[PDB]
Amino acid sequence: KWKIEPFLPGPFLEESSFMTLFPKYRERYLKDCWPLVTKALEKHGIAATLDIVEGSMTVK
Amino acid sequence: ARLWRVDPANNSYTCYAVFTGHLESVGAVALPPPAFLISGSQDRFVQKRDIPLRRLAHDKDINALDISPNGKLFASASQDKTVKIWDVEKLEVQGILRGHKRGVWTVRFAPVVLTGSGDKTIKLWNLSDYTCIRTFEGHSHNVLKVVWLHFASAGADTLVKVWDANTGETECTLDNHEDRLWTLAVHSKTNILASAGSDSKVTFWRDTTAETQAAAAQAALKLVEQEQTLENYIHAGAYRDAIVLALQLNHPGRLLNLFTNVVTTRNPDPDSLTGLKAVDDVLAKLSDEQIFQLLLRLRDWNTNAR
Amino acid sequence: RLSKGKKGLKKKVQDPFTRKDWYNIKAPAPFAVRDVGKTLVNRTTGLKNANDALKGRIFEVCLADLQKDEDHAFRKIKLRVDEVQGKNCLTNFHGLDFTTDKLRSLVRKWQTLIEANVTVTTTDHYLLRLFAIAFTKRRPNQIKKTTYAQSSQIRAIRRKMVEIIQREAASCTLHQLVSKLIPEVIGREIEKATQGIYPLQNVHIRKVKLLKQPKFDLGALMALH
Amino acid sequence: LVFGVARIFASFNDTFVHVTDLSGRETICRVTGGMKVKADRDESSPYAAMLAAQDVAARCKELGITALHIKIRATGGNGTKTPGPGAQSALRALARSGMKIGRIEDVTPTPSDST
């Protein structure tokens, strides 16, 4: 009654994307700890980029 | 509200009596050309009107009304857990019923009153003392309907159960319906229940206790007659008919004693199988189910060694 | 499965989709695509014409699938509707908002934002409010982590912002205003004129609310359409 | 294809799948979780939203719009400002039983200063 089954199997017409901004110390930590997050998000199927110039994470 | 004539031997059905009454929705209708009409209410305006008067009874909505066969007392039910009894002619109040736990939904007069309430209980009250004479449990929701016999009680748990108050214990339960159950009729002469759901199903039940009582009584008649004929057969020695009857009536002790004597009659037929050609004939003309039950008894008597 | 209602409440249900009916929407001039969708509404008859209902309603659509450009995935717009034809529903501008996700995306610590709200009257007697938001620039080749501006600089920057927005919104009409709002010229000119007092990281117009419309000029409306 | 906008009001207590036209005024169909599950404790279940989204998607494809813009919200005044398991499992069941998804937006009412 409460259990969530894992989704077994194009459900997106408009390529959706979200963004967030962060400061510099977070940029340092996020840059040397990013590849874990992008491996897991690629496993789920979501392209994630980090921008150390502007300081912005984007998922799409 | 309105009042209609039915004409059975014509296609005429008119609404020739009408009543405006009060401003909310009329709740229930009670009838003792007819005498008069007593109308309930969604508000607290109970009214009484004749055919070619107001009162305030409860606080919440009122639910159900009923008239005696003679038309002298009058009870009203409401969701503020009170039953209000009063006189049908004047404006007086003959008393007040003290309380049913959650809120009374239906009332009934006994051809002594009955109350089916919001909680999973149902009470039988009296006029003389205004005390609940009997109480009953067993439902799973509201009850919404109590109907006398010649009582049965619905629930909102798709279950209608009939019993009798003088005993006080549940007699029979009926579960034809889907989700809900609202009402119940009864033939004025015999016992016919009409249970309708909030689903579209309406089932009709008839009494069967008398029919199964006569059937079981006739079974008792033939049982004692055939048992005495078996005892006569044993005492006479007509082993063939005794075996036939014991196989029809199923008691294996007497069956086994008869079989022991027919195995040892002390004077056997030479070309018989078990000693008597009659017993060979019945064992030949055995039907299949009798062969099977004989195989069961034979398994047991073979388990023993004597 | 089992019902729970009170006694006598569930009436007879009626199919509404008999008297429900469709209407193609049409967008105004300066957007790239005119067909924006369809509107289901009650059927017209006496006793409250669907003409009155459709004059009542408003719509909200996104600039992404208006301009066919995923760059304007934010900056959603709101369209009133005043006209109706046979199976067609002409629309007119009403408002412009962002996404709350976009605002949360834009806020950042150790840099300050300045807001400004102006009440401008365009040529067509439309009173409207423009709320613009501007985030402070972090200058390349700096070591100091906090890019804070003094309150005098912030008030002067908001004063310049009010001046620029009013000067470039009180000279033109509403169609010219939204033809300005689509490619974001106003934030560009704000940045260009305010970078001398303090550089701004980005200047957006986060809200545009039309308050009062005083006219019903179907000539101008069909001129747009 | 016709886009219809579905407001998923997903509280911690109940779930509301609501389908309207692009105006937001003309309600096509709504199905909650409490009207599909008997237990008030289980009223906010991912199972409740799964049944609700199946019913809603069946209705809106029987109408034949097959494309939804999704707006998710939560109790935003003094509540939690975060959606529910209703929201997540409802979106999953929807785009599993059809329903080409267009624009997703988490439109919750966020107060500037509440109390």
Added chain:
RNA sequence: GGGGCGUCAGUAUUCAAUUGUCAGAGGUGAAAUUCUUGGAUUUAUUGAAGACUAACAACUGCGAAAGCAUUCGCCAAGGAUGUUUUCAUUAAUCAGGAACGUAAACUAUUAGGGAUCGGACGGCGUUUAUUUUUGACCCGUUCGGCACCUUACGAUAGGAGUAUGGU
């Protein structure tokens, strides 16, 4: 983001209206009270009321404390800096006195350094800058202050068990 007065907005909450509504909604560990075909909750658009000013928001800023964060306008005050500005003890301290006003619950230097904000001076240069202004970024000098760490320069400030006998 010192105070006072007015003014401007932003949402949200509550209330109300209109429209689409069609069986629950609301809690809670679970319930219930309650509101609910005269249509709740919900969806969309408005209007009114009262409140507060999210994110920005800090090992920051301000005021003597308590305290102070929407925009703008007015009113006075206040701090720091600079001066090629004055009077020259007017000073410091506090008896007495005067103005401001549900809680608690783990606790003459230190000798520099790196931050920080407010002035002021400077100047290799990037950017405003269509080129002078000017402002932003960098760095150096000099006052002032909110705090960090390091250094001290030092200092100094009955309880629990077990018995016995009475009341």
